[PDB]
Short mmCIF file of all heavy atoms in Angstrom, two decimals:
data_model
loop_
_atom_site.label_atom_id
_atom_site.label_comp_id
_atom_site.label_asym_id
_atom_site.label_seq_id
_atom_site.Cartn_x
_atom_site.Cartn_y
_atom_site.Cartn_z
N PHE A 774 -10.38 -100.17 -65.96
CA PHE A 774 -11.69 -100.37 -66.52
C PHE A 774 -11.82 -101.75 -67.10
O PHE A 774 -12.90 -102.39 -67.05
CB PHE A 774 -12.02 -99.37 -67.63
CG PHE A 774 -13.34 -99.63 -68.35
CD1 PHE A 774 -14.55 -99.42 -67.74
CD2 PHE A 774 -13.31 -100.23 -69.59
CE1 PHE A 774 -15.69 -99.66 -68.36
CE2 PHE A 774 -14.50 -100.48 -70.22
CZ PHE A 774 -15.71 -100.18 -69.62
N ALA A 775 -10.78 -102.30 -67.74
CA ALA A 775 -10.81 -103.72 -68.16
C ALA A 775 -10.66 -104.64 -66.98
O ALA A 775 -11.03 -105.82 -67.15
CB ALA A 775 -9.70 -103.92 -69.20
N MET A 776 -10.22 -104.15 -65.86
CA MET A 776 -10.26 -104.94 -64.58
C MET A 776 -11.60 -104.73 -63.89
O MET A 776 -11.88 -105.36 -62.89
CB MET A 776 -9.09 -104.46 -63.68
CG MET A 776 -8.78 -105.41 -62.52
SD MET A 776 -7.36 -104.92 -61.48
CE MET A 776 -8.07 -103.54 -60.66
N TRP A 777 -12.47 -103.88 -64.42
CA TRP A 777 -13.82 -103.67 -63.93
C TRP A 777 -14.81 -104.41 -64.82
O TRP A 777 -15.67 -105.14 -64.20
CB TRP A 777 -14.26 -102.21 -63.86
CG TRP A 777 -15.62 -101.95 -63.33
CD1 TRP A 777 -16.00 -102.14 -62.06
CD2 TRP A 777 -16.71 -101.53 -64.09
NE1 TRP A 777 -17.31 -101.84 -61.98
CE2 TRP A 777 -17.80 -101.45 -63.16
CE3 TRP A 777 -16.89 -101.23 -65.40
CZ2 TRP A 777 -19.07 -101.05 -63.62
CZ3 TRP A 777 -18.18 -100.81 -65.84
CH2 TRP A 777 -19.20 -100.74 -64.97
N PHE A 778 -14.83 -104.21 -66.11
CA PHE A 778 -15.91 -104.76 -66.97
C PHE A 778 -15.77 -106.21 -67.06
O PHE A 778 -16.77 -106.96 -67.06
CB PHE A 778 -15.85 -104.06 -68.31
CG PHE A 778 -17.02 -104.43 -69.18
CD1 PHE A 778 -18.25 -103.90 -69.01
CD2 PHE A 778 -16.89 -105.42 -70.16
CE1 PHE A 778 -19.32 -104.26 -69.81
CE2 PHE A 778 -17.92 -105.80 -70.96
CZ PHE A 778 -19.17 -105.22 -70.76
N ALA A 779 -14.55 -106.75 -67.21
CA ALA A 779 -14.35 -108.17 -67.27
C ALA A 779 -14.73 -108.83 -65.96
O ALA A 779 -15.43 -109.86 -66.00
CB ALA A 779 -12.87 -108.51 -67.65
N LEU A 780 -14.29 -108.24 -64.91
CA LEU A 780 -14.60 -108.73 -63.56
C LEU A 780 -16.08 -108.69 -63.29
O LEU A 780 -16.68 -109.60 -62.69
CB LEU A 780 -13.83 -108.00 -62.51
CG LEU A 780 -13.57 -108.67 -61.14
CD1 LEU A 780 -13.03 -110.01 -61.39
CD2 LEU A 780 -12.59 -107.85 -60.43
N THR A 781 -16.73 -107.58 -63.69
CA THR A 781 -18.16 -107.42 -63.51
C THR A 781 -18.93 -108.43 -64.27
O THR A 781 -19.87 -109.08 -63.71
CB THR A 781 -18.58 -106.01 -63.98
OG1 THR A 781 -17.72 -104.97 -63.40
CG2 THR A 781 -20.00 -105.74 -63.69
N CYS A 782 -18.62 -108.76 -65.53
CA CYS A 782 -19.33 -109.68 -66.28
C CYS A 782 -19.17 -111.12 -65.69
O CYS A 782 -20.10 -111.74 -65.34
CB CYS A 782 -18.81 -109.72 -67.76
SG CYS A 782 -19.36 -108.30 -68.73
N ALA A 783 -17.84 -111.41 -65.31
CA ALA A 783 -17.50 -112.73 -64.74
C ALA A 783 -18.17 -113.01 -63.39
O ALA A 783 -18.76 -114.05 -63.22
CB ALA A 783 -16.00 -112.78 -64.58
N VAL A 784 -18.08 -112.06 -62.45
CA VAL A 784 -18.68 -112.26 -61.17
C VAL A 784 -20.16 -112.01 -61.15
O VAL A 784 -20.92 -112.96 -61.04
CB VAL A 784 -17.96 -111.31 -60.08
CG1 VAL A 784 -18.62 -111.47 -58.76
CG2 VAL A 784 -16.56 -111.68 -60.00
N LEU A 785 -20.58 -110.78 -61.52
CA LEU A 785 -21.92 -110.34 -61.27
C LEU A 785 -22.90 -110.93 -62.32
O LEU A 785 -23.99 -111.33 -61.92
CB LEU A 785 -21.93 -108.81 -61.34
CG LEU A 785 -21.30 -108.31 -60.06
CD1 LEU A 785 -20.87 -106.90 -60.14
CD2 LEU A 785 -22.35 -108.45 -59.00
N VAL A 786 -22.51 -111.05 -63.58
CA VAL A 786 -23.52 -111.45 -64.56
C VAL A 786 -23.58 -112.97 -64.52
O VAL A 786 -24.66 -113.56 -64.66
CB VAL A 786 -23.25 -110.85 -65.93
CG1 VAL A 786 -24.20 -111.32 -66.95
CG2 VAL A 786 -23.30 -109.36 -65.86
N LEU A 787 -22.44 -113.65 -64.37
CA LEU A 787 -22.40 -115.11 -64.50
C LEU A 787 -22.58 -115.76 -63.13
O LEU A 787 -23.55 -116.48 -62.91
CB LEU A 787 -21.17 -115.57 -65.18
CG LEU A 787 -21.25 -115.69 -66.69
CD1 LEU A 787 -21.10 -114.35 -67.41
CD2 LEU A 787 -20.19 -116.67 -67.23
N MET A 788 -21.66 -115.54 -62.17
CA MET A 788 -21.73 -116.35 -60.92
C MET A 788 -22.81 -115.87 -59.97
O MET A 788 -23.62 -116.65 -59.50
CB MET A 788 -20.35 -116.29 -60.22
N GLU A 789 -22.87 -114.49 -59.85
CA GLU A 789 -23.99 -113.99 -59.05
C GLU A 789 -25.32 -114.15 -59.68
O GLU A 789 -26.30 -114.44 -59.04
CB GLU A 789 -23.68 -112.45 -58.82
CG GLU A 789 -24.45 -111.74 -57.67
CD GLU A 789 -24.75 -112.54 -56.38
OE1 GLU A 789 -23.97 -113.39 -55.92
OE2 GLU A 789 -25.77 -112.19 -55.75
N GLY A 790 -25.36 -114.01 -61.01
CA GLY A 790 -26.63 -114.26 -61.78
C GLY A 790 -27.10 -115.65 -61.67
O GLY A 790 -28.30 -115.89 -61.60
N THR A 791 -26.15 -116.67 -61.79
CA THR A 791 -26.62 -118.03 -61.74
C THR A 791 -27.14 -118.29 -60.33
O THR A 791 -28.08 -119.09 -60.20
CB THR A 791 -25.49 -119.07 -62.18
OG1 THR A 791 -26.09 -120.33 -62.39
CG2 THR A 791 -24.36 -119.25 -61.22
N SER A 792 -26.45 -117.79 -59.29
CA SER A 792 -26.94 -117.93 -57.90
C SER A 792 -28.40 -117.45 -57.78
O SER A 792 -29.27 -118.06 -57.18
CB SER A 792 -26.03 -117.22 -56.96
OG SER A 792 -26.47 -117.39 -55.65
N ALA A 793 -28.72 -116.30 -58.42
CA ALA A 793 -30.07 -115.74 -58.30
C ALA A 793 -31.06 -116.53 -59.13
O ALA A 793 -32.18 -116.69 -58.71
CB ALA A 793 -30.07 -114.31 -58.76
N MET A 794 -30.65 -117.17 -60.20
CA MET A 794 -31.60 -117.94 -60.97
C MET A 794 -31.79 -119.33 -60.45
O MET A 794 -32.84 -119.92 -60.69
CB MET A 794 -31.24 -118.02 -62.48
CG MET A 794 -29.99 -118.82 -62.82
SD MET A 794 -30.23 -120.59 -63.14
CE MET A 794 -31.09 -120.57 -64.71
N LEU A 795 -31.05 -119.70 -59.42
CA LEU A 795 -31.29 -120.95 -58.84
C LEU A 795 -32.09 -120.86 -57.54
O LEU A 795 -32.77 -121.84 -57.18
CB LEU A 795 -29.96 -121.71 -58.61
CG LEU A 795 -29.37 -122.12 -59.91
CD1 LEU A 795 -28.02 -122.67 -59.79
CD2 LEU A 795 -30.26 -123.23 -60.53
N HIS A 796 -32.28 -119.64 -57.03
CA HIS A 796 -33.27 -119.47 -56.03
C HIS A 796 -34.62 -119.11 -56.64
O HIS A 796 -35.62 -119.38 -56.07
CB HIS A 796 -32.92 -118.37 -55.03
CG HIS A 796 -31.66 -118.61 -54.31
ND1 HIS A 796 -31.57 -119.48 -53.32
CD2 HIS A 796 -30.52 -118.03 -54.45
CE1 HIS A 796 -30.37 -119.46 -52.82
NE2 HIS A 796 -29.64 -118.58 -53.52
N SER A 797 -34.62 -118.39 -57.75
CA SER A 797 -35.89 -118.25 -58.43
C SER A 797 -36.34 -119.60 -59.05
O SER A 797 -37.55 -119.78 -59.25
CB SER A 797 -35.85 -117.15 -59.47
OG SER A 797 -34.85 -117.37 -60.46
N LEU A 798 -35.42 -120.55 -59.31
CA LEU A 798 -35.81 -121.89 -59.54
C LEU A 798 -36.22 -122.69 -58.27
O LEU A 798 -37.14 -123.57 -58.32
CB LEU A 798 -34.65 -122.62 -60.21
CG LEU A 798 -34.90 -124.08 -60.73
CD1 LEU A 798 -35.91 -123.99 -61.87
CD2 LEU A 798 -33.65 -124.65 -61.25
N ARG A 799 -35.64 -122.28 -57.10
CA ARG A 799 -35.99 -122.98 -55.86
C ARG A 799 -37.31 -122.50 -55.34
O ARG A 799 -38.09 -123.28 -54.64
CB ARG A 799 -34.88 -122.73 -54.89
CG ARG A 799 -35.01 -123.43 -53.55
CD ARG A 799 -35.48 -122.62 -52.43
NE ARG A 799 -35.28 -123.27 -51.17
CZ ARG A 799 -35.82 -122.82 -49.97
NH1 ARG A 799 -36.56 -121.78 -49.97
NH2 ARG A 799 -35.56 -123.49 -48.86
N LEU A 800 -37.64 -121.22 -55.44
CA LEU A 800 -38.95 -120.66 -55.03
C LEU A 800 -40.11 -121.32 -55.80
O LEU A 800 -41.17 -121.44 -55.27
CB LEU A 800 -38.92 -119.22 -55.27
CG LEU A 800 -38.66 -118.21 -54.17
CD1 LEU A 800 -37.37 -118.27 -53.56
CD2 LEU A 800 -38.80 -117.01 -54.95
N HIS A 801 -39.85 -121.73 -57.02
CA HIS A 801 -40.88 -122.43 -57.79
C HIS A 801 -40.91 -123.88 -57.53
O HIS A 801 -41.96 -124.46 -57.51
CB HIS A 801 -40.61 -122.12 -59.29
CG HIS A 801 -40.87 -120.69 -59.61
ND1 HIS A 801 -40.05 -119.72 -59.29
CD2 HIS A 801 -41.91 -120.08 -60.21
CE1 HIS A 801 -40.46 -118.58 -59.69
NE2 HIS A 801 -41.63 -118.77 -60.27
#
């Protein structure tokens, strides 16, 4: 679980999330 929640925050919320906010910045 600590190999899930840490990994989930690191990958999905930060790296994946930044990727999505730079296409919502690119669409604009």
Side-chain angles (χ1 to χ4, degrees), residues 774-787 789-801:
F774 175 73
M776 197 178 72
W777 181 71
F778 187 78
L780 201 52
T781 308
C782 288
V784 178
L785 288 161
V786 178
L787 273 78
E789 196 38 31
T791 194
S792 179
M794 65 90 71
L795 289 171
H796 301 285
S797 61
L798 188 64
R799 185 259 192 192
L800 261 64
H801 291 77

